[PDB]
Structure 1
Amino acid sequence: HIHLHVPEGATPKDGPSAGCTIVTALLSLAMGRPVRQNLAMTGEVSLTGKILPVG
């Protein structure tokens, strides 16, 4: 079990658009490698790693 938190401030439609980071969080938490420093990222994903556009 893993508690998770994403800070509020995004408009609701943007909620999913952050989602691509979540898996990265999961992966870094899982495998344990810290993610590479100074590397932002964003975008939505459609249930199998395909990426989608965002405004």
Structure 2
Amino acid sequence: IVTALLSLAMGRPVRQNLAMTGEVSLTGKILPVGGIKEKTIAAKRAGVTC
């Protein structure tokens, strides 16, 4: 969501085929998320490279 807004703020598209995930806590220190194997297989299925 953050990177979404930021892209919109400047109009620059995000670099293509870039998936990401995480959590942010009002100062940007990303925090762990769980279940990573399932998101991993989904990303491999979608062809996203990064």
TM > 0.5 between the two?
A: yes
State the 4+ residue runs in structure 1 displaced beyond 2 angstroms: none
- Once residues 54 and 28 of structure 1 are traced to their aligned partners in structure 2, the CA distance between those partners, rounded to angstroms, is 23
Counterpart in the other structure of 2:33: 54
Structure 2: state its 5+ residue gaps.
35-50
Q: Larger helix proportion, structure 1 or 2?
A: 2
Report the count of equivalent residues: 34
Residue 19 (structure 2) aligned to one of 19, 40, 43? 40
The alignment's TM-score, normalised by the length of structure 1, stands at 0.59
The alignment's TM-score, normalised by the length of structure 2, stands at 0.65
Q: Larger strand proportion, structure 1 or 2?
A: 1
